[PDB]
Design a protein around this ligand. Structure first.
Ligand SMILES: [Mg+2]
Length: 287
């Protein structure tokens, strides 16, 4: 079936992508390519996708583009809403990796056009911003050892990071104390390979919570985020909602977009969006 590929500003000179798209066009497939320039554009092209009667709107880009498209799709009122497909055309591609999208773009394209579509959750913060992958929160200022800088810059989108007090409540969950990193996940992975929520499933109606207590980012935290480390200094929960509050501003990075304040209500939007996913998809619950 026909698709509309929503491409980023950083994709218009990807020759392999062009080659792949072009090779699939000359196989009988209808594939519209639209390029975004500013926010609001994905929305505009999502609705043009509708007018065409298209079956998949394909986010070609980073976790940001996927979130722009996803957010636009869930806002659609009506009957014939396109499934979400995903091309891994970002720098980090955390969500795409974690849901098993193939690196081979012809394959990823084909998945995105002809895969099975399944309803997945999204999440919303403060009845406003939505996210499909991960919300990471910490206390710091907005943006020697590279392991550590990578976390503060890439994962947290900050220049500084310090622990501070907060309280967090959710179903079966109540905690107060100093936290260095808060991970609230629909997906499992953020900031280029950091495993914030190893146990996340994207269609269980449930957000994973992990609170990393600390002092600073130590080999502890770098270790525990890369591969798997089983660690007592990590507090875990699972809830359809989490409330977070703090005497000083916490900064949440929601699929790459910052938000600050003393109070956050984060809540699952159950089965909000159909996404084209491989059958083995590690983040879908067993059936
Ligand atoms: Mg879940």
């Amino acid at each position: 079936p026909a698709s509309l590929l929503i491409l980023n500003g950083k994709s218009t000179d990807n020759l392999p992508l062009r080659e792949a798209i072009m090779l699939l066009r000359e196989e009988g497939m209808t594939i519209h390519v639209r390029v975004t320039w500013e926010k609001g554009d994905a929305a505009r092209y999502v609705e043009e996708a509708r007018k065409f009667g298209v079956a998949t709107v394909i986010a070609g880009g980073g976790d940001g583009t996927i979130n722009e498209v996803s957010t636009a799709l869930i806002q659609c009122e009506g009957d014939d809403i396109p499934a979400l497909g995903i091309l891994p055309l970002g720098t980090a591609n955390d969500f795409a990796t974690s849901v098993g999208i193939p690196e081979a773009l012809d394959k990823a394209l084909k998945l995105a056009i002809a895969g099975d579509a399944i309803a997945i959750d999204m999440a919303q913060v403060n009845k406003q911003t939505c996210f499909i992958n991960m919300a990471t929160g910490g206390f710091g200022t907005r943006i020697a050892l590279g392991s550590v800088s990578y976390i503060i810059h890439g994962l947290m989108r900050m220049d500084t990071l310090q622990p501070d007090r907060c309280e967090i409540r959710g179903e079966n969950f109540h905690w107060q104390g100093d936290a260095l990193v808060i991970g609230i996940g629909n997906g499992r992975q953020a900031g280029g390979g950091q495993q914030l929520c190893p146990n996340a499933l994207i269609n269980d109606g449930l957000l994973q919570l992990r609170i990393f207590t600390g002092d600073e980012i130590l080999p502890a935290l770098v270790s525990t985020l890369k591969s798997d480390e089983d660690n007592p200094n990590i507090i875990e929960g699972a809830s359809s909602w989490f409330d977070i509050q703090a005497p000083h501003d916490i900064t949440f990075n929601l699929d790459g977009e910052p938000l600050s304040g003393q109070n956050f209500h984060i809540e699952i939007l159950p089965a909000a969006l159909r996404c084209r996913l491989p059958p083995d998809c590690p983040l879908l619950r067993s059936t």
